[PDB]
A paper describes a structure:
Mucopolysaccharidosis type IIIA (MPS IIIA) is caused by the functional defect of N-sulfoglucosamine sulfohydrolase (SGSH; also known as sulfamidase, sulfamate sulfohydrolase and heparan N-sulfatase; EC 3.10.1.1) and represents one of the most frequent lysosomal storage diseases worldwide. SGSH belongs to the sulfatase family and catalyses the cleavage of N-linked sulfate groups from the GAGs heparan sulfate and heparin. The leading cysteine is post-translationally converted to a formylglycine (FGly) residue, which is crucial for the catalytic process. Despite the low sequence identity between this unique N-sulfatase and the group of O-sulfatases, they share a similar overall fold and active-site architecture, including a catalytic formylglycine, a divalent metal-binding site and a sulfate-binding site.
Here, the crystal structure of glycosylated SGSH is presented at 2 Å resolution. The crystal form grown at pH 7.5 is designated crystal form S (small unit cell). The structure of this form was refined to 2.00 Å resolution. There are two molecules in the asymmetric unit of crystal form S and eight molecules in that of form L. The enzyme appears to exist as a homodimer in both crystal forms. The enzyme subunits display a low rigid-body structural flexibility in the S form (Cα r.m.s.d. of 0.20 Å between the two chains, with NCS restraints) as well as the L form (r.m.s.d. ranging from 0.10 to 0.17 Å, with NCS restraints). Electron density consistent with the position of a divalent metal ion in O-sulfatases was interpreted as Ca2+ based on bond-valence calculations.
Residue numbers in the entry:
A (entry chain A): 22 to 504
B (entry chain B): 22 to 503
Write the structure that this text describes.
Amino acid sequence: PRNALLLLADDGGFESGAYNNSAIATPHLDALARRSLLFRNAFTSVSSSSPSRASLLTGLPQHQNGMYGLHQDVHHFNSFDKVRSLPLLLSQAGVRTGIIGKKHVGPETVYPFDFAYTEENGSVLQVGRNITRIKLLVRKFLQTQDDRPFFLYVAFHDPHRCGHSQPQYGTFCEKFGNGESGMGRIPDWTPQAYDPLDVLVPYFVPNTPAARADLAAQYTTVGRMDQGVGLVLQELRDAGVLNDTLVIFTSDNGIPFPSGRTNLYWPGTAEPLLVSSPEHPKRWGQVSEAYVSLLDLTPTILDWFSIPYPSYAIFGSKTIHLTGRSLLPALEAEPLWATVFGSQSHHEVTMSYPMRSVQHRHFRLVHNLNFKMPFPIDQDFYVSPTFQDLLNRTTAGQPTGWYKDLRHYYYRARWELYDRSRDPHETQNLATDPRFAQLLEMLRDQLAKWQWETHDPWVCAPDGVLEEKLSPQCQPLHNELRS
Amino acid sequence: PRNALLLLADDGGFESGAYNNSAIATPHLDALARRSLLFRNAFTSVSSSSPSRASLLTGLPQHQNGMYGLHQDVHHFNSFDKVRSLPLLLSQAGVRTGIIGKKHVGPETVYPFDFAYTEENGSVLQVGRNITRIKLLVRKFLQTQDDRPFFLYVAFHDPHRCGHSQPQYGTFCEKFGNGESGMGRIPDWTPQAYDPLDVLVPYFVPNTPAARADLAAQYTTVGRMDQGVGLVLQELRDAGVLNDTLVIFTSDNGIPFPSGRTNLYWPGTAEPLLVSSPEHPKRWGQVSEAYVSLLDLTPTILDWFSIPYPSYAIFGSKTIHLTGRSLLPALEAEPLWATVFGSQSHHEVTMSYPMRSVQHRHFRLVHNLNFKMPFPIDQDFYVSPTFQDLLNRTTAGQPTGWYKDLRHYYYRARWELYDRSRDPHETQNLATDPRFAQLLEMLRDQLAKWQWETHDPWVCAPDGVLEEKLSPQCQPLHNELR
Ligand SMILES: *[C@@H]1O[C@H](CO)[C@@H](O[C@@H]2O[C@H](CO)[C@@H](O)[C@H](O)[C@H]2NC(C)=O)[C@H](O)[C@H]1NC(C)=O
Ligand SMILES: *[C@@H]1O[C@H](CO)[C@@H](O[C@@H]2O[C@H](CO)[C@@H](O)[C@H](O)[C@H]2NC(C)=O)[C@H](O)[C@H]1NC(C)=O
Ligand SMILES: *[C@@H]1O[C@H](CO)[C@@H](O[C@@H]2O[C@H](CO)[C@@H](O)[C@H](O)[C@H]2NC(C)=O)[C@H](O)[C@H]1NC(C)=O
Ligand SMILES: *[C@@H]1O[C@H](CO)[C@@H](O[C@@H]2O[C@H](CO)[C@@H](O)[C@H](O)[C@H]2NC(C)=O)[C@H](O)[C@H]1NC(C)=O
Ligand SMILES: *[C@@H]1O[C@H](CO)[C@@H](O)[C@H](O)[C@H]1NC(C)=O
Ligand SMILES: *[C@@H]1O[C@H](CO)[C@@H](O)[C@H](O)[C@H]1NC(C)=O
Ligand SMILES: *[C@@H]1O[C@H](CO)[C@@H](O)[C@H](O)[C@H]1NC(C)=O
Ligand SMILES: *[C@@H]1O[C@H](CO)[C@@H](O)[C@H](O)[C@H]1NC(C)=O
Ligand SMILES: [Ca+2]
Ligand SMILES: [Ca+2]
Ligand SMILES: [Mg+2]
Ligand SMILES: [Mg+2]
C-alpha cells in the first residue's frame, strides 16, 4: 500500500540548511530536502494555529470551515459539524489514521483519528516536544498496522514559544529535557546551543540583544524539532515502509515575532514546504517556484490515495468545492501556478481584525476589514522578550532597531499593495499610487470572486451587508467607508 | 408542591396594557399583571437572542458562558461544555424540565430538557408561533407529569420579524395562520388588525408611514403572543396546577427597530417583566421600581426550588459565582436595588462591536470597545421597511423623522454617559462634561469590577492586554487609545 506522513512544525519558518540558512544545524531536514521537491513560494491561507490546522486538514478556508479563531479554552471555535475533513474521508476509504502531538482543532467528530495522542488526552510536553516519546508513539503506531494504508500526522509543538505557558523551560522551551537540573532528559535529543551573535536576524525582527537572545533560543528548539523529524523517518525506515510513503513537511504559520504570526504579511504566511514522493524521484533535490497554498495539501493527499472529494453542502444547497489543487503534478513538471489567497477573521476571540489577501506572483494585496482600530496583539506574543523590548524602547524614545514603528504596525491602511520583487520588506504601499490602479482592480476582483466561491460571510464587510435573496447581494450601509 | 413556568417573548417590548400602552389589546398579559409584581426597570444584560437566552438560562453573562453571538448556522456560537445551566441543575435536583418553542442555544449537553419541542426537532413556526400547537404541547406535558415538580419554559417566537426569513407571511409573520389563502389557520387565534395611525410610535422609532405600517404588523403579532400566554395559563388552570406555579413573563431583547435590538441603549436592553407567585400575593397588581437583570432569573428559580448553585470552575480553578440575585424578596418588600450590567461581544459573527455597560438608577454608561469602526447592522434588521426608509431618506437628503442621524448611529464615542431622568432619549453624552467626572469614575470602576468578577476576556480591551501571571494584570499596548 501507499501511505502518507504529514510532519508539521508549529510556528516554524525557514530556519534550515534546506532554505539556505547556514547558521543553523538541521541535518535531518536537509537530508529530507535531498529526497524532496522544495517549494520556495508556499503559503498558509491563515496565520493562526487552529484556523491553519483546520484549513490544512479540510482544504477549506477558515471562513468556510468555521474555525474562525483559536480552538482552546476561552476562544472556543470549532468547525462545522457537516464539514468532511481529510481524516474523515481517509477513514471512510479504508485508510488507517493517526495523530501524535498538537491537534488544536475540533470537534472530534469532524477530525476523527483512529490513533490519537494529543493535548486532549495527555501532556502536550510529552506528545509535542519530547521527541523520544514521539518516536515511541510512531513506533507503536507502525507496529499496529494491519495491511491497510496509513495516514500519520505528526504535529510537533516545537518551535512554539513557552514564555506564556511554561516560563522555567525558557522562552521557546529550549531547556526542557536538556539534562540540566530541574529540566529532565530527552535521551534521543542532543541540545545545540547558539550564541545570540551567531543567529540570522530576519528583516522583520528588531536587531537588538533581547531579540537575538530570543532567536538563539528558537534555534535550539528548531534543532530539537529537526532531530524529531529524523527519528520519525528512521522509525518508518525500521518498519520498512518509508519507501512506500508520501512525506510532506510544513509549518502552520509564520514565526512568533513582529510582522510574523497573526499577519497576512509575507513573514506571517510564508511556510517551508517539502514534498517527497518515492514514486516521483525526477525532481528530488530541486526547488519549485510555483505559488502554492496549504489549501493544496488535502487535495494532494486525496489524490495520492485516489479518493474523490464528495459533492455535499454544509448549509442549504451551497455545494462545497475545493479551491486548492493537487501538488502531485509539480513532482513531474514545473507548473505556472501564480495565485494564492489568504483569509483570517480572529485569532483570540478578543482579536477581531479580519484580513483578506490575494497574491499574484510577487504582488500582494491585503484588505484590512477593521482598519480603523489598532491591530490586536496576542497574549503569548505580548510577553515575548522581543515584543517587550520593542515596546519598552518605543515608549522610552530609544531606537528600536526595527524596520517599522509601532504606530504603523497598529494603524494600517484598508488596502495594502506590495511588490516584493522590488520591495521585499513590504514597506512601500502601492495602493495609493495611481500607476498601480489597474492592477489593484484586477487583484480586488480576484479576491472577491474567491470570497464568494468559498462562501465568505465577510464578503460584503465592512461597507455593506450580505443579503442573499436580492441583486446585488451586497447592499450598502452608507457608513462613511469606501464602496 | 412548587412548580415554575417561564414565558419568554422574542423581541418583545412594552406593547401591552400592563405597561399602559392603550392602543394595543393584550387582555391575557393584563390579567397576568393583576396577579403579578410588574417591574418597571428590568433589563437584559445583552441585546442579542442566543446570548440573551444563554445568560437567562445560566445566570452568567455572555462573556462568561461562552455564547458570544448567535447560535445558528454560520455564526455557530455555543456555551462552554462545563457550564451548569438552570435546566441541568433542576434535573439533577429532581425537577422535570420542558421546553416548547425557540431554543437557539447549545450545546444540548449544556441545555438538556426532558421534554423538548424546538427548532432542533421540528418547525420553529409550529412550535414558536402556532399557539394551538403550543397549547396542545403544554397539555401533553402536563398530562405526563409524575412524582415530580416541573419547570416549563415556553419560548414564543412571536413577536420576531419574518421579513428576512419568511416574507410571504408579512414583516412580523402577522399573516401566518390568519385564515387567508396560503396562510393556513391557527384555530385558537383571533387576528387583531391595527390601522398604522393607531399605533404608538416609540421615541427611538422614526414616525413615518413606513415605520407605522411596520408597528401595525408587529401589534397583530404581539396580539398572537398574548393569546398564546392566555392558552398556556389556561392549560395549567385546567390541569389544576396554576396555583402551585411560579409564573415569570419576560422578553429576551429590545424591539427590532433603530436603537433597539443589538444596542446597549435603553431601548435594546429594557424588558417587560412580570413575576406571579401564588405564595406571595401581597404585591399582586403592583409596580416595582427596583433595577433588575435577566441575570436574576436563574437564581430566582433556584431559590424557588431551594436548589443551591454548586461551586465549580469552567476553566482551571477560576470558581464560578452568580452576580445576579433572587427576585423573591421583592415579592414581599420593595428593595433598594439600583445597579444593572450589560455585556455584548458579537451578534452575527461578522458583527464584532463589543459593548460593556453599567446602569446606576437613571444613569447609564456604555463603553464601545471597537468605537473607531462603524456600528454593524444585522441582515434581518437591514431589510426592515423601517431601516430601508431611514436609509433611503438619509441617502436622498430628505428628513428622516428620526431622533438621531445615521452618522452618529454608526460612529459612537468610546464612552457614552447618559442621565435618563433629564435626557430619557439618551442623546446628550455627558462623558466629556468635567462636572460629571467623579460619577464617570464611579461607574467605570463598578463596571471593571464586574468584568473581572465574571472573568471577562475583554476586560483589558481595547487599550491593553490580559496577562494573568503579572501585577497589574492589564498590560498596556500604547496603541494611541487612552
Ligand atoms: C521523554 O520521554 C521519555 C520516554 O517516555 C522519558 O524517558 C523515561 O524516563 C522514565 C523516568 O526516569 C524511565 O522510567 C523510562 O524508562 C525512560 N524511558 C526512556 C526510553 O528513557 C524521558 O524522561 C522524557 N523526558 C522528559 C524531559 O520528559
Ligand atoms: C522504492 O520505491 C520505488 C517506487 O515504488 C521502487 O522503484 C520501482 O520499482 C519497480 C519494481 O516493481 C519498477 O518497475 C519501477 O520502475 C520503479 N520505479 C521507480 C519510480 O523507481 C523501488 O523498487 C523501491 N525500493 C527501493 C529499495 O528503492
Ligand atoms: C397549527 O397547529 C395545529 C395543531 O398542529 C394545526 O392543526 C392540525 O393540523 C393537522 C394537519 O392539517 C391536522 O391533522 C390536525 O387535526 C389539526 N389539529 C387541530 C387541533 O386542529 C394547524 O393546521 C396549524 N396551523 C398552521 C397555520 O400551521
Ligand atoms: C392556592 O395557593 C395558596 C398558596 O399555596 C393557598 O393558600 C394557602 O393555603 C394553604 C392551606 O390552607 C396554607 O398553607 C396557607 O395558609 C395559604 N397561603 C396563602 C398565601 O393563601 C391556597 O390553598 C391555594 N388554593 C387552592 C384551591 O388550593
Ligand atoms: C539556495 O541557494 C541556491 C543558490 O544560490 C538557490 O538555487 C536555491 O534556490 C536557494 N534556496 C532557496 C530555498 O531559495
Ligand atoms: C520592559 O519593561 C518592563 C516594565 O517594567 C520590565 O519589567 C521588563 O523586564 C522589560 N523587558 C524588556 C525586554 O526590556
Ligand atoms: C399605569 O397607570 C396606572 C393608572 O394611572 C397606574 O396605576 C400604574 O402604576 C401604571 N402602570 C405602569 C406600568 O406604570
Ligand atoms: C428604498 O429604496 C428602494 C430603491 O429606490 C425602493 O425600491 C424601496 O421601496 C425603498 N423602500 C422604502 C421602505 O422606502
Ligand atoms: Ca502555530
Ligand atoms: Ca430576540
Ligand atoms: Mg414535575
Ligand atoms: Mg435622521
